[PDB]
Every structure is written in structure tokens, then in C-alpha cells.
Amino acid sequence: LNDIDFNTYTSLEQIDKELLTLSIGPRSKMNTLLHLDVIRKRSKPKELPFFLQLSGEKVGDEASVREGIHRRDQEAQKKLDAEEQMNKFKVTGRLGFESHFTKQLREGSQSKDYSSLLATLINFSPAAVDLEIRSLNSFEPFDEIVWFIDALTQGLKSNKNFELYETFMSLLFKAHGDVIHANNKNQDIASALQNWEDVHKKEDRLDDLVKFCMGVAAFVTTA
Amino acid sequence: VRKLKHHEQKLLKKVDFLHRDTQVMRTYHIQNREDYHKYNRICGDIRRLANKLSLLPPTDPFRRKHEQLLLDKLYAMGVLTTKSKISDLENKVTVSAICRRRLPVIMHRLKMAETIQDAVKFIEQGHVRVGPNLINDPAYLVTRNMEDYVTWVDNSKIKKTLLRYRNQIDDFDFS
Amino acid sequence: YLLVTAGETGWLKYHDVSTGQLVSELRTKAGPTMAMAQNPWNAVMHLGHSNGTVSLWSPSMPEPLVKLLSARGPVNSIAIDRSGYYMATTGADRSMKIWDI
Amino acid sequence: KSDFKFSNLLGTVYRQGNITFSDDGKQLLSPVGNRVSVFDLINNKSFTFEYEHRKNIAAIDLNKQGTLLISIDEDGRAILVNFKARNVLHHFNFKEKCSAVKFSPDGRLFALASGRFLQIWKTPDVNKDRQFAPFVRHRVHAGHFQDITSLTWSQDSRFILTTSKDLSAKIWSVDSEEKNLAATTFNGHRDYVMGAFFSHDQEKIYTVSKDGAVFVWEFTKRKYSWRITKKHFFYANQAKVKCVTFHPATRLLAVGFTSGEFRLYDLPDFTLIQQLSMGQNPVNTVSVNQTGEWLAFGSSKLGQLLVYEWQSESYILKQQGHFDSTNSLAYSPDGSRVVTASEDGKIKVWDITSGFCLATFEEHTSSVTAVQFAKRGQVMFSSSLDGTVRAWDLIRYRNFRTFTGTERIQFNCLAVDPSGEVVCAGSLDNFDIHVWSVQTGQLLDALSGHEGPVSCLSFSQENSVLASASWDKTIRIWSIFGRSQQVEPIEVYSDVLALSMRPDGKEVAVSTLKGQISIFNIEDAKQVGNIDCRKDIISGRFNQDRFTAKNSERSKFFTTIHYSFDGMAIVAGGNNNSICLYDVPNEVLLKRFIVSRNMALNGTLEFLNSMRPEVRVTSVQFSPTANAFAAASTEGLLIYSTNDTILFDPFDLDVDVTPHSTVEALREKQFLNALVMAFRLNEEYLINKVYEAIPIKEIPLVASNIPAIYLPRILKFIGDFAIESQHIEFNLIWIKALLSASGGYINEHKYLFSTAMRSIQRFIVRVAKEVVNTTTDNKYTYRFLVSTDGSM
Amino acid sequence: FELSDVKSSKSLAEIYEDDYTALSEELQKAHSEISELYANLVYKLDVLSSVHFVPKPASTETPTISMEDAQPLYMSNASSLAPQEI
């Protein structure tokens, strides 16, 4: 009633467990996430020898013409430029081996609950999120991917931040879709994806609702 | 400085740091010397565009299109009346043509005010309008169509008296 | 009959005012000239730069006739006796000099 | 409904002066001509301060604790304002032209570089109730010889660096004892000085020149003082430093030259982190986030503002406002986008919900004269003096077509059929309405019959007719479909010059040159009624005039009219200083806003205080969400809104309807009664509370039993809440239940639920299909990645 | 075209270097110049014959940014193409 006494009321976080909710934030974050890479590609900025070696047509050697008989250089020069920035940035500050995100994921796997991982994942910045999801690992045991899949499935069970959990899943399929498809039918990943699919086939009611509302709305307003 | 005498002229024939500009000042009453210089510089700009576009290869779609653009835009401005020539552009675009396009001169030939100075006084006193909106500064070159749609502002003493003489005043319009 | 207009881009122009033609136009490699005063026994322009150097210029040739190191920092002001014999320079490092030109 | 606050300003993201970041680094404050725009970066939003100044803002600053904002215009006139409420606290008058302002990082006091004196004031408390005269001086110093060109505080709040055109940099202290400590100067330096900074430990002092020289002074020994430890140089050809900023905690020096180059250096070792060219015009202002990660750059010549993130090389925002003057306006059919056309040909597409510039279009050449949409989300047409009418998409963002006449004739006004199939354009050199087909492209014909230029056009979007109005003192209603080609001419008393049409499609409203807004019924071709406007217009005087601001008809008429979407209200604007909001059915004015108090703009003084930019409203429109309206004027795209709703506007109350009674209704579980009483009170927070209170298994019963008087208000509220609320299927269950329970009523009175259905479908289209499309994409990706055979 | 009956300023070494290394750069130079000066002219005339203030249009290496971009900055050209034309 304190909200009454101050005649101002705050929206609830989530009304109920069965109710899908969105991230409390901008609606631009979904588009920015799903289309981050192309944003980079469109936001990159715009930009002798003494002994010459000429040819039989360029100089007057039509005889050698009638009996006629640099990309690797640019590749080498590109290598060289890479060396240049590589040793131009030379900070020796002492930084931890294991990044915060991957560590937090690790003990989340240990404890079999990913609450903190989801919290920090949502708190990330979009450029970051893309960076880490791209820079996961794909070794044989597939532990990191399995753990991340479990985290996303746990979140969809949580019924919060529905949009960001789906878009994280799509980003993972974008980056490491190749490996997951390749080593498909491996039992662990199969089970993980099967849980994910179970939750998602549970959620499709939202598609139903949106289609109904749109169809009826157009019918009423134009007929 | 002193209308200096014969011998000292011969020694100093060029020491005066103190008249077509003034001739136009008197004949069509343009506002200031800087105004006249402005018109001259405009004419020179046109001339140099002609020279450089001519230097451009005459057999170029770009050059010919840009030529037609320029000439049409000048015609729309109404400095000149023809369209079929370029030597017209190099010769008859004159400070005289621009200054006769000037608004009070338009008022005079279209017969708003009997004299150029009366026209300018009326522009100051705010009695004319071009299309919807009125005009306060005489140095206002009027486009072809607009100068065709010049007339007085409403409910001005000038229009009231004109209509009174005609005995065609009509107070419903609060003329 | 000569008008001297030293300013900020670092530049000194003699403008003959009777006939009306820029007689001379000398760049100063120094910088924004801080002070300026004319030697009248001599009619040579003393500019005072930010280095702490006075420089004596004449409209004929494009190099300083002479340069003096007066003070450190910049030179606020310079004034010249009417006989063009003595000069006084004041520089923003709280310094004052009396010079035998 | 008749109250509007100035809620936003679009275009001109930066005009002149200092740019700053907020404490949290989440907000960028920019000075626009009179006011201050706040761009909230993480939540992707914008905002503009209601108060104006008298002239252009010359400097800003934000208190570090994120509470106070001082803003000074070009004559010492300073306004001190609060944020957490956005109100003006005081306004003092520092008599000389200020040059820079800074709040000491303690916040206790702020310094002020004006001319060649340094001024240091204490700063008023905010928690303190509004005092009368709270500004108090703390010190004045006059050690310089020319203008103080830049200023800096120390990290501890005890020392001030001032750089002046005397070629010098001065350390002043704030106390007398520390004056004794370091009251020191810094000489020996080339063309100008443009910044001075303490290092992190403060034993090193950097001075950045104008020629391009950096001096590292360092308190070392040859009884010893401030040697010039090192000299670094930029090397630009002729470009010169224009503005510099130094983040000490990460040792960044960002420098913006006059050629449009800007560089980032790491300072002590002095390495070039990077270098970019923003444009061919000088970079005019710089600032740095506190965490060192975001750089803000302002260039004034084009009014372009950039926020860059150098760690990751990513542009958080890169907008550039219009150059000349927003000539015309158009809203998207649902209300999300706004397209504005300059006097240059720049046609920019803005998004509203985040006040940003989604795109620009440059394919026009001369000034654009009118812009308009279809009754569809697809297309958009523009008309310019170019002699062309250009048809753009807005899903691929590209021209369909360039309609044009035959003689390259300039087009003043535009209109488009509802079916998006016929395009009509009215010139001024021909006074024939040229009519093109969309899909074919080649112009059908020239509707002729006016004499004198065709001032404006529009289409009745129900009978699908067009009214065309001309300086022939006349209106002309054409039916141009189906075998007939029939005309109907009506006469007004004087030159019509603006026109608009009832959304239902029955009436026209035409503003003439006497300043009377006549209103006609179409089918009867008769005059339903007119509204005088001559006296309720605040024109402006001209400093070059010889007469008064009353007895001149300089802008005594309205060149822009538009209806509201209930068809009950009219917004009007012209070359005058006023935007007047009338209402049709009773012929009166509801409101009058003054567009700008800025004596720089010409017609802004009513009595002068004993060629140039004038103020004028080129075109107005309502919003298809009918909670806000926009006016495109010489200073940009002003947007007034109602989204405050700080107002007790009840409806059909009775003595027993109180918020406490509503809460008691909730507790005793009559959800229908609670909702009805909530609307009867008509208060947003109570509506919100009850709405989120009632349960799902009972929503359908409520939707069944809501009274028909409250169907429209509930639909509208649901739409305007479901845009920015995160309870999707809550809103969707609600909407589905509403449509199910009452559909036939809405179909029978579609014109009454227009804006309601518009908002609902906007919610579903813009922020529901997107979630479901991503869902579908993931579902199919999973199906394919599992179903198919593996690799190898 | 026309030959050059004046002495060649660059010897064989140089002309072969040139053969070792938009139609005519001089042509684009003249094109840009005439465009700029014509913009100046139309400025002058619009100031003279308009009714409302008009500003001077503009002023007239290293990597550059593009502040205008006639796409929403997140749309791929693969998505701006239409199926008929591909």
C-alpha cells in the first residue's frame, strides 16, 4: 500500500511461472545480437626496383610473343602487417588464465545450477556476448557446449528473458553449428538437445497466440 | 588631395588611394557599391563556368547535360528569356539584366510605384507581397513565376486608396 | 608612407598606403609576434617573439636584419628611444632589459 | 488530451559547444541550439530538456554526483537545473562571455573560465530548499594576458590548470597555503596552448599545444622546479589541434584536429593507438567516459556527433543531424518511424522509440518539398524541386522509381492513393496536377482546371477522392476512378494554402490567407464551419523591420494544418512563432505553444529590447498513436507528447470510488468491478496495479463483461502498455480475450477504435512477430541439425 | 588524339616504369572543380532570390568513417537484393 500512499506503482518482474517474460530492457538488443556480425562488416572504415623485368609484348619483342613462353606477395605483406600490430601491442600486465565467464560456467557445471551464469550472461554487453559465444571450445568431450546447452535449457525453464535465451541459442547454432552437426548423434549432445527441444515444443503456444491475435485484428479492422 | 599642380602631377601621376558603379547607382538605383560588385562577380562566375565547360570536351554527355542544367536554371531565374543559345549566355548576362530583375524595378515596369525610390520606400514600409508572404528587403531578385504573382499586401492604406479612387472598395474583404 | 601589420599567423606585411600596393610580405618562422615597435632613427621594425628574441626586419629582404635574445619566455613589449639608440624590452618572466641598439 | 509537454527534439544531435558524459557513463549530454539533449546509451533512448535559453548554449557541465547541471549561454546567462526531477532551480548572470565550465570532482565548487579571468564559485546545495540567491564567489584570479582557452581540475579537488592564448599554462591552487605551494606558471611554448592535464600521480604535467606539440613537465632536479622532461610532436601537414582530452587513469590522450582527423595516443610512452578521419570539417569537441572506454566526438559544421569505443572499435552511435532546415515531415502508418526531408534533399528515416537515425537517402538533388507514406508499411514517396517524384521502399531501403513530368517541373505538393496505386503531384510552374501510376510508371495524365499554382493535395481514404486546393482562391474535389472523371469546384474567400482531410473521409479543412480555417463537407460541397485565427497568433518582430509585430501580416496565417485521429482536433502552424491547437466541432482553440524563445532567431522578440535565421514551422502532423505530435521547424523536429499523464482526469466518478475502495475490491475478488473503478478514476498507476493483479483463469469473464463505454480506453491502454512491457502473453491473452468477447462491436464502429487497433497491431507486428520469428528459426535449425546425417 | 611534338619530359626508364604501373584523372579534376564552383553559383543565386535564410552548403589520406549510410547499418546486401534480379 506504500505504492498507494505514494500514488506510484512499479511493474512486476514476472506475473507467474507459466507466463513468458522478456528481458527488462531495450527491444533493440535482440536485433543487435542477431545481426551483430554484419554490423561489424558494414562499420569497418573505408581504407621502384632498379632492375625492371618487362615482357616481350610490352617492349618490342613480338618474336618472344609469337613463341610466347603477386597475390603470394600480398599474402606475405599481410602476414607482415599482422606481425606489426602483434608486436606493437606489448602490454605485459598480469591477467588471469581463465576468463570470468568460462570460470563461472565451470563451477555452474560443478554445482549443476547455472543461475549466476545466466545472470552474468544477461548483464553482458552485446559485443561481449558474441565474443564469448564465438570463443567457446569444441574439443572431443564437448563439455563446454553441453554445459552451455544445459544453462540455456535451465533458463527457458525459468521462463524469464525468453527472447535473449532464444537468441543466445541461435547465436550458438550460428557459430558452432558446424561442430554440433558434425558430431551429431553423440549421445551427450543428443540428450542435451533433446531436453532443449522438449522445453521448446512446450513453449510454441506463443506462436499460436500471436497468429490468432494478428488474424482477428486485421479481420476486424479492415472488414 | 589638393588637385595637385602640373609638375607634381608629372612626378606623382598615380598617388590616389582615395564609374559604372555610380552610373547604375543613378540609372536603376541599386542599393550599394558592394551590391554592384556582387553583380559583377556573379557575371564573372557565369563567364568562367562557360569557359571551363567549353574546355570540357564538347562531345560529352556530362558536359552537355550540365550545360542544359545551367541554362535552364538561369532561364527560370529570369535573367534571360531565350533558351536556344550559349553565346547568349556569354554575352547578354549583364549587371543590367540582373538589376532590371531586381524587385523595385519589377514593381516599376509592372507599375506598382511610379519611381524606383518610391518602390524601395514601399518595400521598407511593408506593403508588397510575393505569393503568400511579404517582402521587406528590396535586393530581392524575383523568379519568373513569382514576379508574375507579385501584388500588394492586404488591408494596406495603399490598396485602400487605390480602390477608393476606383470607387471599387469592398469592406467585406476589409480591403 | 608605410603601414606595417604584424599579427598572429606570424607574418609581417608592408603596405604602401599612398599608392596602395602591398610592398612586402615576410613570413616569420618564429610564431605569433608578441610585441612590435619601430626604430624611427632607422625605420626598422623590431618584432618581439615568443622565444624571447627581438628581431629587426626591413621591407627589402626576407630574412631578419638581426636577432637579439632579450629574455626567456615571451617578450611582452618593446619600446625604442626617439634617437633609436636605446631600447627597453619587457618579458613575461618578470624581466626587463635596457639595450644599446 | 489537450495537454502536451515538449518531450523530444529530433535532428541536430549537436550544434555548438561542450559535449559531456554522465557520471555512470551511461548518458551523453549534448547542447543543441537552445536546449540540451540527453542520449541514454545502454537503454537506447533519448530525451530533451524542456527549458530553453535566450541564445545558443556555449558550455555545459554535469556535477559528478549526477545531480546538478549548469549550462551557460554566450552572455554569462547561466541556468542551474536538477536532473532527478528535470526542473530549473536558479538562473544567474555571469556578466562576461563564459568560455568553459567545470565542476570540481569533489562537487563542492565549480570553476569558470571567462575571458582572461578565472572565477571560482561554490555550488548550491540541492537538498536545500529553493533559496533566493544561492550563488557565492570563492575566488577570482587574473594572472593571464589573453583569453583562458581551456581548463582542468586535479583528481584531488585542490588544483586547477588553466591554458591561455598567452601561450601559457598556469597552476592555481584552491587554498592560500597551497597557493604558496604551487601558484606556478608554464611558459616556453609555440603557437597556442589547448590543454593541460595532471598525470595520475600528479608529479607530471602535460601541456598540449595548437601547433601539435606535447610537453611533459615533471617536477625534477637540475632548489629545483618543473623541467620540460620530454617533447613529443604530432605531425599533421597543416592541421592544427582543435580540442584535446586526457583520461588519466588509463593515460589516454584523444586529440581532434581541424582537418577532421582525430588521434588516440597512449601518453607517457606516447604511442599512436589509432587515427581516424570523421570528415572534411574540424573536430570540435571531445570527451571521455570515466572508465576510459567510450569517446565522444562532436563536429559542428554538419552537426555530427559520434560515440566510439576504441577498445573494441565499435560505434555506439554515429548520428548526423540535418544541415539546413527540416522542410517536411511524415509519420509511419503505425507510428514507429518518422521521415523528414531537408532543404538539401537529405531524406532521413528516424526511429521514435529510440530517437535515432535509422537511415538517410541522398538520391534527390534539390530541396525536397513534401514527403508522404501510403496506407501501408511498404512504401514512401517524396517530392522535390528537382522535378521528380521519387518512390522509395522501406524494407529494402531503395528507390522503386523516379516519376517525372516532361519539362523537369518542380513539385510543391504530393498525395498518394490509399491503394498505393496512383501518385499525384502538384507543381507551381504549371498548376496541373500530374498523375502517375505506381506499377506502370508512366504518368497517366494531367488533371487540369485550376489557374494559378496548385497549393496542396490530399486523398479521402474512404471514398478515395482527392481535394486539390490552389491560390485560385479555390478548392477542387476530383473523383478520378471509374469512367467518370468528375470535378466539383468550391470557392473560398482567399488564397487557400493548406489542406487536410478527416480520417473518416467526409470533410476537408483548408487554411486560407486571411487566417481562417474553413471546414467543408465534401459530398454536399458545402461549408460546415470556419475558425478564425488572426488574433491568437504570436508573430515575431524583425530587427531589420520599420514597423511593429502586430500590425504586419508577416505570418498572420497558417501554412500547415492537420487533423487528429478522432477527427476532433486540429494542429496548425505557419511562418509565425506559434503552434495553435484548435478543435473542429466547437470552433475554438484548446492550446497555443510557442515554438522557441531564442532572440537569435529573427521573429522571436515581440518588442525589441532597446538575411538572418527566422523561426517558422514548415510542417506539422499528429501522431497515428495520438499521444503526441511533431512540428518540423527551422530548428529541427520538435515532438510534444502526453506520455507524462501527471493529471487527474477522472470520468463519471462517484463518492464511493476511491483508490482504497479499488484495493478493497481486489481483496474481495470482484475483478470486473475493480477494473471499472480503476478506469473511472483514470489513473495510470491504479490501472496498472489492478490490471496486473487479476488472474488468468478469470481474464475471459472480465473481457466478456467490460462495458462498451470502456472498450476503447482499455484497448488503447493495453496497446500503449504492451509496447514497453515484458509480460507478453499476459498482454496477448488480454487482447485475444478482448477481441473474442467484443469483436462485432468493434467491426460496427471501426472508426471509433481506429487508434486502439492501430496500437494493438503495432505491438503485435513490431514486437511479437519478431520473437516468434526467432523462435521459428531456432526450431527449424534444431530440426535440421539433428535430423540430417552427420558429416564424413 | 594528338601527339606531342615537344621534348618528352620523362625518359625511357620513366615511361617504361609508367607502363609497368574513371577515364582521365584530369577529367575528374575538372569535373569536381566545375561542380564545386557551380554549387557556389547556385548558392549565390538562391540567397539572392529566396525568401528564407540558406546556409553556405559546405567547405571545399587516412581511414574514414561514413556518417550517412543509406541502409539501416544492420542490413546485408544479400538481404537487400530481390529474387528476380539474382
Nearest-angstrom CA–CA distance, D267 and D403 = 57
Sheet holding C2-4, edge to edge: C2-4, C11-16, C21-27
Q: What's the burial of B126, exposed, middle or buried (CB within 10 Å: 0-12/13-18/19+)? A: buried
State how far the Cα of A126 lies from the Cα of A128, in Å rounded to an integer.
5
Three-state secondary structure readout of E2-65: CCCCCCCCCCHHHHHHHHHCCCCHHHHHHHHHHHHHHHHHHHHHHHHHCCCCCCCCCCCCCCEC
8 A C-beta contact, residue D13 and residue D36: no
Those residues whose C-beta lies under 8 Å from the C-beta of residue D622, and which sit 6 or more positions away, are D331, D562, D563, D564, D565, D571, D628, D629
B3/B9 Cα distance (integer angstroms):
9
Write the DSSP string, A99-146: -HHHHHHHHHHHHT--HHHHHHHHHS-HHHHHHHHHT----SS-HHHH
Q: How was this structure determined?
A: cryo-EM
Closest by CA to D785, choosing from A170, E52, A14, A7, is A170
Resolution (A): 3.8
Q: Edge-to-edge, what's the strand order for the sheet holding D304-309? A: D285-288, D294-299, D304-309, D314-317
Distance from C-alpha of B145 to C-alpha of E49, rounded to nearest angstrom: 12
Q: Flag if C93 and D168 touch (Cβ within 8 Å).
A: no
Q: Which chains touch B (3 or more CB pairs under 8 A)?
A: C, D, E
Residues of E in contact with B55 (CB under 8 A): 30
For B42, the closest of E30, E34, E44 (CB atoms) is E44
With touching defined as 3 or more inter-chain CB pairs under 8 Å, the answer for chains C and B is yes
Query: CB–CB of B15 and C17 under 8 A?
Result: no
Cβ distance of E62 and D279 shorter than 8 Å: no
Cβ within 8 Å, pair E19-A58: yes
In terms of Cα–Cα distance, which of B35, E43, B27 is closest to D344? Answer: E43
Question: Is E74 close to A31, i.e. CB distance below 8 A?
Answer: yes
Give contacts of D190 with chain C, Cβ < 8 Å: 31, 50
d(CA A179, CA A166): 19
Grid coordinates representing A202 are 512446450
Q: Are D547 and B125 in contact (CB < 8 Å)? A: yes
**Chain D residues lying within 8 Å of E32, measured CB to CB:** none
Helix ranges, B56-171 (H): 61-77, 87-91, 95-101, 103-109, 116-125, 144-148, 157-166
Say yes or no: E45 contacts chain D, CB-CB below 8 A.
Answer: no
Q: Residue-wise over D87-120: b if at least 16 C-beta within 10 A, else e?
A: eebbebebeeebbbbbbbeeeebbbbbbbbebbb
**Touching C: which chains, 3+ CB pairs < 8 A?**
B, D
Are residues D635 and D596 in contact, defined by beta-carbon separation less than 8 angstroms? yes
Q: Are D202 and D219 in contact (CB under 8 A)?
A: no
Burial of B123 (0-12, 13-18, 19+ CB in 10 A): buried
For residue A66, with 0-12 CB atoms within 10 Å meaning exposed, 13-18 middle and 19 or more buried, which class applies? exposed
CB neighbour class for D609 (10 Å; exposed up to 12, middle 13-18, buried from 19)? exposed
Mutate to test the interface with D, among B120, B133, B146 (most CBs of D within 10 A): B133
Name which of A148, A150, A151, A119 is nearest A134 in CA terms.
A148
The rounded distance, in Å, linking the Cα atoms of D488 and D524 is: 10
Cell readout for D355 is 530517437
